Amino acid sequence: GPQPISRLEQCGINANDVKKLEEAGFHTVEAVAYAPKKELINIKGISEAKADKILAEAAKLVPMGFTTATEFHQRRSEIIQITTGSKELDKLLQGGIETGSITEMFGEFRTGKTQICHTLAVTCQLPIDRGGGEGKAMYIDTEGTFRPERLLAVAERYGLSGSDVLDNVAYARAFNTDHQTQLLYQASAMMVESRYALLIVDSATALYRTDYSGRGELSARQMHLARFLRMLLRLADEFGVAVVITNQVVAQVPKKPIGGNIIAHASTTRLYLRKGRGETRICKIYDSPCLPEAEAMFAINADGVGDAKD
Amino acid sequence: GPQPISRLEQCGINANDVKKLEEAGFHTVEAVAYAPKKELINIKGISEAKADKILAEAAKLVPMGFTTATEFHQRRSEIIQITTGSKELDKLLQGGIETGSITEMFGEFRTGKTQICHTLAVTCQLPIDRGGGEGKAMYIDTEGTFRPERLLAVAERYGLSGSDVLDNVAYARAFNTDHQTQLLYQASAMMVESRYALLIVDSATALYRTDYSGRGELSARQMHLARFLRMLLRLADEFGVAVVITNQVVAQVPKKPIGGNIIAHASTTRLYLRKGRGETRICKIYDSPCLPEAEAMFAINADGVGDAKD
Amino acid sequence: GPQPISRLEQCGINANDVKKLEEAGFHTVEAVAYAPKKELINIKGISEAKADKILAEAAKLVPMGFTTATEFHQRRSEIIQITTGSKELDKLLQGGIETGSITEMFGEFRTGKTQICHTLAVTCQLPIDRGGGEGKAMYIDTEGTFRPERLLAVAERYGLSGSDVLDNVAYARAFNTDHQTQLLYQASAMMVESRYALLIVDSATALYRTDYSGRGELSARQMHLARFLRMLLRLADEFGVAVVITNQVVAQVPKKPIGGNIIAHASTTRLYLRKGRGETRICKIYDSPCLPEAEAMFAINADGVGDAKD
DNA sequence: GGATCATGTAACTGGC
Ligand SMILES: Nc1ncnc2c1ncn2[C@@H]1O[C@H](COP(=O)(O)OP(=O)(O)OP(=O)(O)O)[C@@H](O)[C@H]1O
Ligand SMILES: Nc1ncnc2c1ncn2[C@@H]1O[C@H](COP(=O)(O)OP(=O)(O)OP(=O)(O)O)[C@@H](O)[C@H]1O
Ligand SMILES: Nc1ncnc2c1ncn2[C@@H]1O[C@H](COP(=O)(O)OP(=O)(O)OP(=O)(O)O)[C@@H](O)[C@H]1O
Ligand SMILES: [Ca+2]
Ligand SMILES: [Ca+2]
Ligand SMILES: [Ca+2]
Ligand SMILES: [Ca+2]
Ligand SMILES: [Ca+2]
Ligand SMILES: [Ca+2]
């Protein structure tokens, strides 16, 4: 895991400065080592003469320099992949939902974006031997569509105790794009105390359509969204968590997701879920750096996402 | 219930600013805490130096941060669900129409969308022990199809006095999509004085088809509809009311509702009502985050929506 | 290849000064001969009386003066051009990706910018007879989208041993625009020990959008980007390497790359990759000093970039 | 013993 920022005290930085960084939003040596000098200068008391030291001290602990592709490949092969609850889907994602990267599943209504985010909120608590991620879940909602009774229905399918599952899911609701980005700063706090394995934002773009209405507000909403998606990338790098965000679609004037190019570039995996028949949906890999563009065929059963009981 | 915005006076904000917010459309601390900084800046007198304070003061009263899924589940289990007037329907919706979320029932003509909205306007006044919601009703109409004589016919079935029922239903007619959105701002006013348990918009999209005619006006009508549906979500969150909106259908060129993706995403529950035989209709769950896609079989009797008297 | 800066010791400069230059960022006589007097003065110990000598001594070894266009043309005709993995693309680039110049491929998501950078990371190790570049690869990533399993899939297609290929690719991740420019200084170190044939930055502008947010920060981000792109040009001139950088696009408010004029001028070749159908993309020459503006039609197969298997 | 001037980018539905 990541080293808490209090470790920096043992290096030459007084607690007055460290406690100035924790108030800014840094609760981990990684989060400071990743930050550029410009952000440290931007703190009310962190003078230039300090930030140069803080950065040079933090870089001593974390590896910034190069490495051969072998160490990366060997380390990457040990990355956790949370099971989706569907053998057909994991066969498509080659194991499951990666961690340390941003996955985005978009699709027309009813296609089960919130349902996948609900099983993932549970299976991410399974032991690694069972495909899970061995950690708590973190569910930021922007719709009011968080239904814990759907967490129990899948918790019982996997044998876990419904009591503990509803205790290892930290829920919060965003009421506007400002609160939504603010909950991420409070998220970095909680993520250094307990171990989280999955952070969910559902939906990641639902509030941006309405908070920025005028045609002149469009360039400002994509840039506010860009910082939000970058904040999400910082949590994945620093905490080794798995970020799953949910998008919405729009008609090409056939379905095409919203958010624009800023979200299509930032996302590493895009899953396009369309409805098939009855309760069986069709997930297709829209974008990925390693998976071939293919399709699967999962379902939405009374016990969460599963396979098409045909 | 929600705290009126005058409570904010006891914190450091002068009445000149509070009375500037009430003129904007905020009559509740929640409605201010949910609003983003951008909207407060947009008021004629609320400078940046104030909005940062107003937001930071309002957030002290209402909970914005995280919480475990247990507190949510325990609190969610105590949510009110208004009876539909049909045992078969409540068995489908698992208790009745939820509050604090947007329910949408669409369907071909005659299929009883206005009739369901008429019984709901009455049963939402029943005591909670009888399945109701213990509160007044709020009926925005965009068709002229509000018939109070149908409110009496169901008021007498439930034993309530027809006099009081027609006194606890606040009716208003929208003549265009602008007036329709304007009535919501006057709705937040009335909802903080009295206690409302149900807000109805029938129909929610009937006026959008005609107010925006040209093919180039389509992107502007979906965005005006997006703000309207977001205004509806703010009332459900802030006032804990139950929003029921009515849609229309169109032929796939078999029935498919209008409004597009902006209304399908925003709605949490979509009910598809088709005609069966005689006076018996068939409600089917088109979209929901917790209910399985099933069907029921209600009817339209002389005393409102009921069960198929077979 | 380029002469290491220790060769300058055999001329009249003491090791104290040379070791002062290597700490600055010069590890090659060329890199010193190219540097202006102003930069040498800027070192903590290199007085004016030294820099004039160091420059005049370095210029004795490397050719700075004029030459006829014949020697250049004869020498230019012997420049290496790394194969893209697609016969259709090499026919467009007339042989492949040039070395000693900055190539930039931009395009909407999914269009295979990271995939091209992945095959190029492998084929640049092929012997020159097979179209490669006979050298190691250098992959600076700013997205976390470096997938070594895609390096193996193309390594096996070309018969090379997957073990050695993942040993000749030096990977590093940039977490902000400061670290990104810092990795170039550590790159000049490694490039004088081993022989590199290709340096990759993917993406070259992804971090600049977010690190500089305010409208007033725009003039400072283009200038920080200008130095970065100049650092890239110094590596191409001094080390004879091939620099391939990846850009992102934005909507004209159809696709137009970001970075502004500073990156459009600095780039010598700009390739515009759009999606065609299925797995077949379309690369078009946006800017080049010698190639006509044409298009090709490659693909993204399970073994990397290739030709459209039609 | 004794004063003085100059530049630089960025998305979005609707029957017979
Ligand atoms: N308990 C359940 N058992 C079976 N199916 C269910 C259950 N709860 C919901 N569903 C089904 O799951 C689907 C709802 O999916 P979900 O709520 O994830 O959609 P979504 O992509 O979030 O949509 P939107 O854009 O409207 O928010 C519907 O088909 C619904 O019938
Ligand atoms: N008093 C009544 N007793 C019995 N049935 C009635 C009564 N009033 C209306 N109905 C029936 O209810 C149906 C009308 O339903 P309703 O007005 O809710 O339709 P709707 O979905 O709003 O339609 P539209 O799209 O045309 O507005 C018809 O079948 C009509 O015969
Ligand atoms: N192993 C594979 N086999 C076949 N196709 C693949 C494979 N891995 C990825 N792809 C395809 O390659 C494309 C991804 O391209 P790439 O990752 O290079 O895009 P990009 O230009 O970097 O995008 P972005 O801006 O999102 O980073 C997708 O169409 C994906 O389906
Ligand atoms: Ca949802
Ligand atoms: Ca992407
Ligand atoms: Ca009606
Ligand atoms: Ca919905
Ligand atoms: Ca990429
Ligand atoms: Ca150029």
Please report, rounded to whole angstroms, the spatial distance between the CA atom of protein residue A30 and the C1' atom of nucleotide D1.
Answer: 72
- In this structure, what token pair is assigned to residue B181? 């959105």
The reply to whether residue B69 touches residue A144, judged by beta carbons under 8 angstroms, is: no
Q: What is the dihedral of CA B105, B109, B112, B117, to 10 degrees?
A: 50
Residue among B229, B267, B288, B290 whose CB has most ligand 1 atoms within 8 A, to mutate: B288
- Residue appearing with tokens 């009739």: B115
Angular region, A50: left φ>0, alpha ψ -120 to 50, beta rest: alpha
**Nearest CA to CA, how far is C277 from chain A (Å)?**
12
Contact C113, C105 (CB under 8 A): yes
Optimal mutation site among A29, A268, A290, A293, interface C, most CBs of chain C within 10 A = A290
Q: What are phi and psi of C122, to 5 degrees?
A: -100, -55
Q: Which residues of chain C make contact with A227, given a CB cutoff of 8 A? A: 210, 213
Residue spans of beta strands (DSSP E) within chain A: 67-68, 81-82, 97-98, 102-106, 136-141, 169-173, 196-202, 242-246, 249-251, 255-257, 269-277, 280-287, 298-301, 304-307
Span CA (B153) to C1' (D15), Å = 37
Query: Counting Cβ atoms within 10 Å, is residue B306 exposed (0-12), middle (13-18) or buried (19+)?
Result: buried
- Do the beta carbons of residue C272 and residue C284 sit within 8 Å? yes
Closest CA to C119 of C143, C95, C92, C97: C97
Burial (CB count within 10 angstroms: exposed 0-12, middle 13-18, buried 19+), residue A44: exposed
CA B21, CA A251: separation in Å to the nearest integer?
37
Q: How many CA atoms lie within 13 A of A221 on its CB side?
A: 21
The amino acid that residue C47 corresponds to is: S
**A100 contact residues in C (CB cutoff 8 A):** 144
Ligand closest to B94 (CA) is 1
Cα–Cα distance measured from residue C37 to residue B153, given in angstroms and rounded to the nearest whole number: 96
CB atoms A261 and C151 under 8 Å: no
Is position B304 annotated in a ligand binding site? no
Per the entry, the structure determination technique was cryo-EM
User: Which residue type is seen at C296?
Assistant: A
Q: Which of A146, A172, A177 sits opposite B66 (nearest CB)?
A: A172
How many Å lie between the alpha carbon of A245 and the closest alpha carbon of chain C?
17
Residue of B nearest to A186 (CA): B65
Cα–Cα distance between C89 and C108 in angstroms, integer? 19
Q: Residue count of chain A, please give it.
A: 310
**Neighboring chain B residues of A108 at a CB cutoff of 8 Å:** 261, 264
Say how far apart CA A70 and CA C134 lie, in whole Å. Answer: 19
Q: Which two tokens stand for residue B156?
A: 């007498």
Tell me how crowded residue C68 is: count the other CB atoms within 10 A of its CB.
Answer: 8
Chain A residues with CB under 8 Å of B34 CB are 175-176, 179
Which chain C residues are Cβ-neighbours of A70 within 8 angstroms?
166-167
Lookup: nucleotide whose C1' is closest to C257 CA: D10
Q: What is chain B's length?
A: 310
Residue A301 Cα: closest atom of ligand 1: 4
**The nucleotide closest to B219 (CA, C1' atoms):** D12
Pick from B221, B134, B234, B123: which is nearest to B176 by CA? B221
| Residue located via tokens 């509803």 | A166
C114 lines ligand 3 (CB under 6 A): yes
Nearest to C169 among A38, A69, A268 (CB): A69
CA–CA separation, C51 vs C60, rounded Å? Answer: 14
Q: What's the distance, CA B100 to chain centroid? A: 8
Helix, strand, coil fractions of chain B, as percent rounded to 5: 45, 20, 35
Considering only the beta carbons, identify the residue of B68, B226, B264 that sits closest to A210: B226
Q: Is B219 helix (H, G, I), strand (E, B) or coil?
A: helix
CB contact under 8 A, A265 and C206: yes
Protein residue with least CA distance to atom 3, ligand 2: B302
**Nearest protein residue to the C1' atom of D7, measured from CA:** C219
Backbone angles phi, psi at B81, to 5 degrees: -135, 110
Ligand 2 mutation target, pool B84, B86, B106, B110, most atoms within 8 A of CB: B110
Integer CA distances (angstroms), A240 to A189, A229, B134, C285, in order: 14, 16, 48, 39
Q: Tokens 């070309």 appear where?
A: C158
Q: Per the CATH hierarchy, to which homologous superfamily does domain A74-310 belong?
A: P-loop containing nucleotide triphosphate hydrolases (3.40.50.300)
**CATH 3.40.50.300 residue window(s) in chain B:** 74-310
Q: Residue B58 region, left (φ>0) first, then alpha (ψ -120 to 50), else beta? A: alpha
Quick one: closest CA in C to A234, which residue?
A: C175
Dump the DSSP string for C206-230: TTHHHHS-SGGGHHHHHHHHHHHHH
Q: From chain B, pick out residues whose CB is under 8 angstroms from the CB of A165.
A: 69
Residues around strand D, C-beta < 7 Å: A 209, 218-219, 222-223, 250-254, 258-262; B 205, 209, 218-219, 222-223, 250-254, 258-262; C 209, 218-219, 222-223, 250-251, 253-254, 258-262
Residues 6+ apart with CB under 8 A from A167: B68, B69, B70
CB–CB contact C175 A237 (8 Å): yes
Phi, psi of A181 (to 5 degrees): -75, -25
Most A-contacting residue of C116, C124, C139, C147 (CB-CB within 10 A), to test interface: C147
Report the distance separating Cα A258 and Cα A209, nearest Å.
9
List, by residue range, all CATH 1.10.150.20 domains of chain C. Answer: 1-73
Flag whether B touches A (3+ CB pairs, 8 A cutoff).
yes
DSSP one-letter string for C94-140:
TTSEESSSEEEEE-STTSSHHHHHHHHHHHTTS-GGGTS-SSEEEEE
- Let me know the angle formed at the C-alpha of B85 by B84 and B89, rounded to the nearest 5 degrees: 55
CA of B220, C1' of D8: distance in angstroms: 38
Measured over the CA atoms of residue A72, residue A75, residue A80 and residue A81, the dihedral's sign is: positive
- Count other C-beta atoms under 10 Å from residue B86's C-beta: 25
Chain D nucleotides close to protein (CB under 7 A) are 8-16
Among the partner-chain residues A179, A187, A206, the one whose CB lies closest to the CB of B265 is A206
> Under DSSP, is residue B278 helix (H, G, I), strand (E, B) or coil?
coil
**Are the beta carbons of A210 and A69 closer than 8 angstroms?**
no
CB contact under 8 A, B66 and A190: yes
Domain C1-73 has CATH 1.10.150.20: yes
Task: Judge if the beta carbon of residue B113 lies within 6 A of ligand 2.
Answer: yes
Looking from the CA of residue B300, the nearest atom of ligand 2 is 5
Query: B247, B257 in Cβ contact below 8 A?
Result: yes
